[PDB]
RNA sequence: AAAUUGAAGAGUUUGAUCAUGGCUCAGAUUGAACGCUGGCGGCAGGCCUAACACAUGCAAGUCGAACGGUAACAGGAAGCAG
């Protein structure tokens, strides 16, 4: 019902010609733990102010996955610039085994059962992309059934 | 019947950013040592260095059913003296 949770929140600064001007950032994840999950980047002078505008940026364009009772529904691979993540599907009871970032986005989404790691760069807001991204991609024996022009029966 | 149920990151370069890239930390372990402290038990372990030098005691004897035998001891026998 949609369920959301601030990864992480970082302060950057610009420069001008009277000294530094500093904001936050937040980067926030939402889900229906369902399959939907979307996570949104927000930018203020201020801390509320910036999750704020994230968390409403996550509940727009959150995106659909195929989950297998509360499980993934094949080992995938995804890549975000630097940050390249991987994430297997694991037995009922073995809870999330996933990192910051990739725990969040995980939890949110609706995964009970995973094993993942994050290769790579571990910058908060490159490897929530990638874990979106992977989840996104990987389809379900439905889907696969339907491109093959198969029953899933005969794909098992 | 059961005997692979298995994979977490964080700090630190920059005014800020992403990347590269090292250093550091969170875990487990030990024939450990040192500091402070210290009630009991069970089960293990205890010269990692000088294969350095070694006082003293012990760590390989046994068989008389292989053999001459009696140093003893323990006993009887024969000779005896009270
Ligand atoms: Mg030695």
């Given at each position: 019902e949609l369920q959301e949770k601030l990864i992480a929140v970082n302060r950057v600064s610009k420069t001008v010609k009277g000294g530094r001007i500093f904001s936050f950032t937040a980067l926030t994840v939402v889900g229906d733990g369902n399959g939907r999950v979307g996570f949104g980047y927000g930018k203020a002078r201020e801390v509320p102010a910036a999750i704020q505008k994230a968390m409403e940026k996550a509940r727009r364009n959150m995106i659909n996955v195929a989950l297998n009772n509360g499980t993934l529904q094949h080992p995938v691979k995804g890549v975000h610039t630097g940050s390249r993540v991987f994430m297997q599907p694991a037995s009922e009871?073995?809870?999330?085994?996933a990192g910051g970032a990739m725990r969040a986005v995980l939890e949110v989404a609706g995964v009970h059962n995973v094993l993942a790691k994050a290769y790579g760069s571990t910058n908060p807001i490159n490897v929530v992309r990638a874990t979106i991204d992977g989840l996104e991609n990987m389809n379900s024996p439905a889907m696969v059934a339907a491109k093959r022009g198969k029953s899933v029966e005969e794909i098992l």
């Open positions: 009871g073995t809870g999330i085994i």
